[PDB]
Amino acid sequence: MRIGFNFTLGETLPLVRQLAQEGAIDYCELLIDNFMQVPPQELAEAFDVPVGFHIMFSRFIESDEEQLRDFAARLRPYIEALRPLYVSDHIAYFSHQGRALYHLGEIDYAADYERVRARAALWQSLLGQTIHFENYPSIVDGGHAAPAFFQRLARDTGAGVLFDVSNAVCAWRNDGPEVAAWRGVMAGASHFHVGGYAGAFIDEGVTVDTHDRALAQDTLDSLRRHRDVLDKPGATITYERDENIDIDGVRADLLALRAIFPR
Amino acid sequence: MKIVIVKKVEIQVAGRTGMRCASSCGAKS
Amino acid sequence: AGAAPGRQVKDSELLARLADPAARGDFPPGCRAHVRIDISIRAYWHTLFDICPGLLDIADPDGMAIFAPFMDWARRENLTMGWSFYIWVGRWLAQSPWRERLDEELTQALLSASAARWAVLDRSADVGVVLGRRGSDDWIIGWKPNTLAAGRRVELVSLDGQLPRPAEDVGVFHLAGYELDSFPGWLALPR
Ligand SMILES: [Fe+3]
Ligand SMILES: [Fe+3]
Ligand SMILES: [Fe+3]
């Protein structure tokens, strides 16, 4: 199990390079659509280690098809240049009746499967790459169906599941399904995420996917419980921190993960 | 046509952590 | 179980409420449905006031003499809540009970905020957005980052006054490269 760190801000490159040298990360996961004006060759010459792609705003389910074809065309040079270990994207509502959602919406797993299927099949063809799709940190109801949803999406289109273990404990803390309900997906999955979470400002009893703190114990205890079906040759797990990105806090979590998945 | 530039200066706009930023999947804090 | 007492509530059942501050009242505190709406209102809140804190001095210190009514007006004008967001709270502030305090300090902060937002969020092949004001011949330009040493850069560019000012209060055009050396003509704020 190789351990990675997410890279969304260029300003954090000195920090990623030094964690690459202490051997605290083995690969690095770029939020690739944040760098699509950085020359592909220049991007590639910044990382000695291998990389993975994470896409934030393809909007592949809801986007206009020609917009999505152009996004794919502009993103293919980056796949050719950096030759990443994997490509990953999101399943969520980004807008409603044309108006942006600043906090993404959970899709209707029952009602929306056929539109997601058709667009995931297409989106993978337009990139020429398998895409692993990330589960949502559910807050309200309906997310009990996500494990079946993701398995069916993988059987039907050949996609992968980028399983965010931390996002699954957020759903579990929000009365969603047990993290154990994902063991089937974990056994078939090769690429994973984990990050910190926090409570909502007005109610600490609901858990929010903030990626701004240290790993919580139920997060680490769920990695230990299912270490048997997460570790495989070629597997990766990306630690994600998007706020409070200081070297000491991040190193504490990257070394806590290697304490669960030693070299 | 013809743009007559005489002075540029950067404007600070707040951002993420150390600012000058980019998107991310985490919810606001 | 249930995100509301006695009711299952899927996120699709709540999307019409996610940018409406008044909707918080439609579910009891303590149910997951109520918190979810709030989580998202505080997302809009922070996007406006964490970036343009000049708004918070005006009216109440929690800004919700400005925040709550603007959000109601945004929905009526069917705004997309895209990057032009900050310029639209400017347009609302123009006909507001707080129309005073419309500092050119604060109007440029809001346009700068919307230039930076375009540069961070836009996923087209363009690399620059330029904003022209009604009372000046200066431009504000938002640039997408093309290196990893710096993020998005917004610039105040001073020009001689020979190029047409935007006909409306604000005007926009986009740049396909990191070169400013032609004038296509102003287009309208994209809503
Ligand atoms: Fe997460
Ligand atoms: Fe994640
Ligand atoms: Fe993600």
Numbering used by the authors:
A (entry chain B): 1 to 263
B (entry chain A): 1 to 29
C (entry chain C): 9 to 199
Q: What did the original publication write about this model?
A:
Methanobactins (Mbns) are a family of copper-binding peptides involved in copper uptake by methanotrophs, and are potential therapeutic agents for treating diseases characterized by disordered copper accumulation.
Similar to MtMbnABC,17 the three components of RrMbnABC formed a stable complex when co-expressed in Escherichia coli. High-resolution mass spectrometry (MS) indicated that the absorption resulted from modifications on either Cys21 or Cys25. Formation of the kink allows the second cysteine residue (Cys25) to coordinate to one of the iron ions in the catalytic cavity of RrMbnBC. The divalent ion (Fe1) coordinates to VcMbnAC18 in VcMbnABC and to RrMbnAC25 in RrMbnABC, providing direct evidence for cysteine modifications of MbnA by MbnBC. RrMbnBC can modify either Cys21 or Cys25 of RrMbnA as indicated by MS data, but only Cys25 was found to coordinate to Fe1 in the crystal structure of RrMbnABC. This may be a more energetically favorable binding mode for RrMbnA to interact with the catalytic site of RrMbnBC and could therefore be more readily captured by crystallography. Consistent with this hypothesis, our enzymatic assays showed that RrMbnBC was active in modifying MbnAs from Groups I–V. VcMbnB Asp240 and the equivalent in RrMbnB, Asp242, are conserved among MbnBs and are located adjacent to the apex of the curved portion of MbnA.
